[PDB]
Amino acid sequence: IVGVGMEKLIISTNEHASTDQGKTVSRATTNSKSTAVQDSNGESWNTGLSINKGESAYINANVRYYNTGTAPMYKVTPTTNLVLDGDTLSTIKAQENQIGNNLSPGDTYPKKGLSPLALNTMDQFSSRLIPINYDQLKKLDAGKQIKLETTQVSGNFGTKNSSGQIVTEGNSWSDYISQIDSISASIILDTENESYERRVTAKNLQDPEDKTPELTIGEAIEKAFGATKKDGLLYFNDIPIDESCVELIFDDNTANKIKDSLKTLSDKKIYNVKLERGMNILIKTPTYFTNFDDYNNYPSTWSNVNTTNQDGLQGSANKLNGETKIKIPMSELKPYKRYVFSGYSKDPLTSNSIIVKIKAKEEKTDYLVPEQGYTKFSYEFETTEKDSSNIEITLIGSGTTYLDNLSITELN
Amino acid sequence: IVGVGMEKLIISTNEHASTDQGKTVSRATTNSKSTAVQDSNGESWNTGLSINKGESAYINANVRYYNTGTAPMYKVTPTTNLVLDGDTLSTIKAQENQIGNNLSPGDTYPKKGLSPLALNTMDQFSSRLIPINYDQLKKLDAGKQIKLETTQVSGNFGTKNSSGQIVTEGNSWSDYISQIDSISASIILDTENESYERRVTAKNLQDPE
Numbered sequence: 061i062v063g064v065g066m067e068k069l070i071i072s073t074n075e076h077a078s079t080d081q082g083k084t085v086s087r088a089t090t091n092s093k094s095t096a097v098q099d100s101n102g103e104s105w106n107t108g109l110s111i112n113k114g115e116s117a118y119i120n121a122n123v124r125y126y127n128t129g130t131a132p133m134y135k136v137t138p139t140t141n142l143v144l145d146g147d148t149l150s151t152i153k154a155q156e157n158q159i160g161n162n163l164s165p166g167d168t169y170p171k172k173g174l175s176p177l178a179l180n181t182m183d184q185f186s187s188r189l190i191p192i193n194y195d196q197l198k199k200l201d202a203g204k205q206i207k208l209e210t211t212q213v214s215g216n217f218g219t220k221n222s223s224g225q226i227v228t229e230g231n232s233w234s235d236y237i238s239q240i241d242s243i244s245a246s247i248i249l250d251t252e253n254e255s256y257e258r259r260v261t262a263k264n265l266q267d268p269e270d271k272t273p274e275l276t277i278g279e280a281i282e283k284a285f286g287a288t289k290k291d292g293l294l295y296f297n298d299i300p301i302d303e304s305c306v307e308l309i310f311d312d313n314t315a316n317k318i319k320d321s322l323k324t325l326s327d328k329k330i331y332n333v334k335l336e337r338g339m340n341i342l343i344k345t346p347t348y349f350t351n352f353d354d355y356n357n358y359p360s361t362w363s364n365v366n367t368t369n370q371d372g373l374q375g376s377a378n379k380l381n382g383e384t385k386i387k388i389p390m391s392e393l394k395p396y397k398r399y400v401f402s403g404y405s406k407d408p409l410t411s412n413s414i415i416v417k418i419k420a421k422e423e424k425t426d427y428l429v430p431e432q433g434y435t436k437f438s439y440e441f442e443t444t445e446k447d448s449s450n451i452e453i454t455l456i457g458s459g460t461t462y463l464d465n466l467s468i469t470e471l472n
Numbered sequence: 473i474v475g476v477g478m479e480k481l482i483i484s485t486n487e488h489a490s491t492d493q494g495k496t497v498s499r500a501t502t503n504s505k506s507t508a509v510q511d512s513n514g515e516s517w518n519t520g521l522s523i524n525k526g527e528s529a530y531i532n533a534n535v536r537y538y539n540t541g542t543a544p545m546y547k548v549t550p551t552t553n554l555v556l557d558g559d560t561l562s563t564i565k566a567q568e569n570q571i572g573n574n575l576s577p578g579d580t581y582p583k584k585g586l587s588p589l590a591l592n593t594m595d596q597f598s599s600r601l602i603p604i605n606y607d608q609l610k611k612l613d614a615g616k617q618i619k620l621e622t623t624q625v626s627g628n629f630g631t632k633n634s635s636g637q638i639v640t641e642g643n644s645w646s647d648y649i650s651q652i653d654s655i656s657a658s659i660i661l662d663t664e665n666e667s668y669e670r671r672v673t674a675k676n677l678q679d680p681e
C-alpha cells in the first residue's frame with residue numbers, strides 16, 4: 061500500500077524584467093539673413109517588465125513515498141494529481157528522476173532523515189516544467205493552497221528461483237490489484253505514529269465451489285496483524301485491541317451487514333461475525349485507556365477508585381455514590397483536534413440517569429440512562445490552542461451504577 | 473556501499489547585456505517673409521541589461537563516488553538531491569555522462585589523482601541545464617550554501633554464463649538490497665583514514681524454521 065505525501069510547494073514566477081540608461085550629446089548652429097550656436101546634452105533611464113498570460117509561473121513539489129502493506133515494491137512510479145479549488149491542473153507520472161528503487165514495508169523513499177525529492181517536470185523526458193495560468197497565479201497569491209492526490213502506483217515484485225536469483229522485471233503489481241481487491245476484505249489498524257493496511261481473503265456464500273476457509277472478524281484480525289492472545293484477548297505488541305478496548309469505524313455496507321448478522325448470532329459480539337467480501341473495517345487504538353485491572357496510561361489519577369469486585373466487563377467497576385474527576389494537563393494533546401471520550405456503563409437495578417459535563421472548547425452536558433447491559437456513550441470534545449485551561453470532566457450519577465473501559469481517542 | 477560527495481558548486485548567471493552607439497547629421501533651411509540655414513551633429517550611447525525571473529541562473533556540481541563495501545559495482549547510477557534551505561531544488565539521476573563503469577571496494581570514481589566529474593544536466597539526453605530562481609539566486613548571493621544528499625544508487629554485478637564469460641547486463645543490486653537489509657545487521661568501522669561498512673546475517677529466534 062503506497063501513498064504520496066506533499067511537504068511543500070515552490071512557485072517560480074516567469075517574468076522578463078530589463079533596464080536601460082542612455083546618454084545623448086547634440087550640437088547645432090544657425091545663420092540668419094546674425095549667427096547662432098547650440099549645444100545639448102543629457103541622460104535618460106528606462107525600466108520594463110513583460111509577463112506571459114498563458115504561462116505565468118512554474119510550480120515545484122516535494123513528496124515522500126510511504127508503504128504500509130506486507131510486501132516491498134520495486135521501481136515505484138506513482139501518479140499524482142494537483143488541485144487548486146476544483147480544477148486539476150495536471151497529472152504527472154513519475155519520471156526517471158523520481159522513481160524509488162526499493163520501498164520496504166514501513167519504510168519511506170527517500171529514507172527518514174533525508175530531504176524530500178522534487179517533482180517539477182511533466183513531460184516524458186524531464187524537459188518541460190509544470191506551468192500555471194495567470195488567473196491561477198492570482199488565486200495562489202490570494203492565500204489558496206494546492207493539494208496533492210495520488211491515483212495509482214506502478215511497481216514490480218520479486219520472484220526467487222530454486223538457486224536464489226531474484227528477478228523483478230516484467231512482474232508488474234497491476235496484474236493482481238483487481239483480482240486481490242475483489243475477493244478480499246480490507247482491515248486497517250491505526251496505532252500511534254504508525255498505520256497498517258491489510259487484505260484478508262473472504263469466502264463467497266453464493267458459490268458452492270468456493271472452498272476457501274471461513275473466517276470471523278476476530279480470527280481475520282489476529283491473522284492479519286499478528287496479534288497474540290493472553291486470556292482470550294488480542295494484543296498487538298502490548299496494546300490491547302479487544303473489541304471493547306478500541307474504536308471500530310465501518311462504512312455503511314459493513315455496518316448494515318454487521319447489524320443484520322448480529323441478530324442471529326448468539327454471542328452478540330462483533331468479533332464473532334463472519335467475514336465477507338468487500339468489508340471495510342478500521343480500528344483506532346485509543347490515546348488514553350484504562351480497564352481498572354492491569355492497564356493505565358492517563359497523565360492524572362482517578363479521583364475515586366473502588367475496584368474490589370468482580371464486575372464491569374472484566375473484574376473492574378470503579379463506581380460508588382460519589383462522582384469521579386480527571387485533570388487534563390493539556391501537555392500531551394493536539395492543539396487543533398477533535399477527541400472522543402468513551403466508556404461502558406451498566407445499571408443492574410433501575411435508578412436515575414447519569415449526567416456528564418465536559419469543558420474543552422465548549423461546555424456540553426448530556427444525560428444517559430444506563431441499562432442492564434454495558435453501553436458505549438462516546439461523547440466528543442476538542443482542543444483549542446495547546447495553551448488553554450485544563451480539561452475537566454464529570455460523570456454525575458447515583459444509584460450504585462457501574463463503569464468500565466473508559467478511553468479517549470482522536471479522529472481524523 | 474556507494475555514496476556521493478560534492479566538492480564545489482559553480483553558478484552561471486543568465487543575464488543579457490547589450491550596448492549601442494549612434495551618430496546623426498541634419499540640415500534645415502527656412503525662408504521667412506529671410507534666409508535661415510541650420511547644421512546639426514549628434515551622438516548617443518546606450519546600455520541595457522535583461523534578466524529572466526523564472527530562470528535566473530544555472531548551477532554545476534563537481535562530485536565523486538566512493539565505495540566502502542565488499543563487492544564492486546558496475547555501471548554506477550546514483551541519484552542526488554540539491555537542498556538550499558529546506559527546499560529541494562532538483563532531483564537528478566545520473567545520465568550517460570556521469571556513469572562509473574567500474575568501482576572496486578575502496579576506490580573512487582574518478583580515480584585518485586583526477587578531477588571530479590561535472591553534473592550540470594537534468595534531462596535524460598543531457599540537453600538541459602539545471603535552473604534556479606531569482607529568490608534562490610539572491611539566497612546564494614547572501615552567503616547561503618547548497619548541500620548535496622544522495623538518495624539511492626543503481627548498479628550491476630557480474631556472473632558466469634554458460635560459455636564461461638562474465639555478464640553484467642540484467643543483474644541489478646536493487647533486487648537484493650531489500651532482502652539483504654531485512655535479514656542482516658550492519659556494522660561500521662571508522663579508522664583515521666578510511667571507513668568500512670559491512671552487513672552480517674542475524675538469526676531470528678521467533679522462527680523455529
Ligand SMILES: [Ca+2]
Binds near residue numbers: 373374
Ligand atoms: Ca475492566
